[PDB]
């Protein structure tokens, strides 16, 4: 188990760690999060008590370094940093643990939720979507726009998701206009899977990361990408059976985790009704259809 210590908590803040959250008071003796499960990416996220504007946070993998959080009073935020002095870092953690100034990652043993939401998410792929090569962790916030959003403005601070556009030359073979527009199989399988992503695991990793950024930061462009990657599969008549079965699992756990009260802002009615009731794959997503119908029947 790994640990992200905090130097201090000078401003009152709601802190998220993956799907968990807790409140910290101004100048409370809070010095970090322990017992973080090795083997998965994680996200540590923030929303300031005095200004709910800008949710922001950091994706990290404790196998890649020793990371801590320290508040910067000039830039006004909690910043992730890497400590290269290993013995210094272990000494800091041990003291804070002995004084019980850390919260424990509150994972129940039966509970596979985080694995289910991050199964295909790799830190190396996150670092290509979020470009800042001098750090091993990745900053995301509520306002960051995507490359696609920009095209339609600082590129160093963008989310470089793979651009999906159903009415584009990339999606439509000259001479196959009706075919490719009504059945997106060639765009999914040849262009996206064989060409850009190389395999379905990388495609699902990006879909999963997009959902997580939409949910944890309210990042609109990420929500757009998540729905586009769903619709591309559902609008394809020829999809490998293992991908359809995995998609049903991925989406089921995403719908299960979504806050009930954010459904109005995180779910696109058109996309979900098309996908579940009109598309080629309308009968291939049984688990997702069942949870959607029982949890959000109004949207449908």
């Amino acid at each position: 188990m790994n640990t992200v210590p905090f130097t201090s908590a000078p401003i009152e803040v709601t802190i998220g760690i993956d799907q968990y959250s807790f409140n910290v008071k101004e100048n409370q003796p809070f010095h970090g999060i322990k017992d973080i499960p090795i083997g998965h990416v994680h996200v540590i996220h923030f929303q300031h008590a005095d200004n709910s504007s800008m949710r922001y946070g950091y994706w990290f993998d404790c196998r890649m370094g020793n990371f801590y959080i320290q508040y910067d009073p000039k830039d006004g935020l909690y910043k992730m940093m890497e400590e290269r002095d290993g013995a210094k870092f272990e000494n800091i953690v041990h003291n804070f643990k002995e004084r019980q100034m850390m919260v424990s990652y509150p994972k129940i043993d039966e509970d596979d939720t985080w694995y289910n939401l991050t199964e295909f998410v790799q830190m190396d792929k996150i670092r290509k979507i979020v470009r800042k090569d001098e750090n091993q962790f990745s900053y995301v916030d509520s306002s960051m726009t995507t490359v696609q959003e920009n095209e339609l403005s600082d590129p160093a601070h963008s989310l470089n998701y793979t651009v999906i556009n159903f009415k584009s030359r990339e999606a439509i073979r000259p001479g196959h206009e009706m075919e490719d527009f009504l059945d997106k199989s060639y765009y999914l399988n040849t262009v996206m899977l064989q060409g850009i992503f190389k395999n379905s695991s990388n495609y699902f990793g990006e879909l999963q990361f997009a959902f997580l950024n939409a949910m944890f930061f309210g990042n609109y462009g990420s929500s757009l990408q998540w729905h586009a990657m769903i619709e591309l599969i559902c609008s394809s008549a020829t999809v490998p059976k293992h991908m359809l079965d995995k998609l049903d699992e991925i989406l089921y756990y995403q719908i299960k985790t979504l806050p009930e009260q954010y459904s109005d802002i995180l779910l696109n009615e058109r996309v979900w009704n098309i996908c579940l009731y009109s598309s080629f794959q309308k009968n291939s997503l049984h688990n997702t259809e069942k949870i959607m119908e029982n949890k959000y029947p109004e949207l449908l």
Partner: protein
Amino acid sequence: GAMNSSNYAELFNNDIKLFVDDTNVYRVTVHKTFEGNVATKAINGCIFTLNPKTGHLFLKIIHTSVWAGQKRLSQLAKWKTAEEVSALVRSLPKEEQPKQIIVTRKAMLDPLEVHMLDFPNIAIRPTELRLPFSAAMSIDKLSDVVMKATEPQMVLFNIYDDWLDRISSYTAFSRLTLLLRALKTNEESAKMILLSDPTITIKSYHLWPSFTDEQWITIESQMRDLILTEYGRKYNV
């Protein structure tokens, strides 16, 4: 965006534009079969592609062979229309290509946009005008060429005859839309109005009677009376 009564003069400016109407592309008769079921039989159709400034009409005849062995024909017909309009644009010299294509039915927007991806600077637009171009097949010389066709064919016409020698495009389009609305509302009476005077004939190279400026006023009045008469019969007014 959408073309309506607010931006109507835009139709007659010097930016090349085409209206595309697909209502006569896929045409059928419905009949009972020997077993008492119902079947359709396709008949030849056409794409109505019109430059409203110059009157040039690109009538692409859609021969029934293009439907053979195809499914979902009403859907295919939109895509075939878009394919053919795309081909027409590519066939035209650059300086004759349209800057805007206005579709009379919103279901044509996606098929045309997809077929015109190679032309990102040609705007594809709907309209809020209710245009009577479905009545094109009530113009005898157009219906004749469509029905006689034995293979796909493009035929070029000027739907305004020589009216632009004496009136503006705006007025010519107004006359055309009134004539077509009348033919749509009561075809038999509209044709009777147009042919009632045997001394006024249709030139071999024209679609409509060689009426004088004063006769066109009378004809236009009679067309408006027809439309109003039919409105009263319909709604019992």
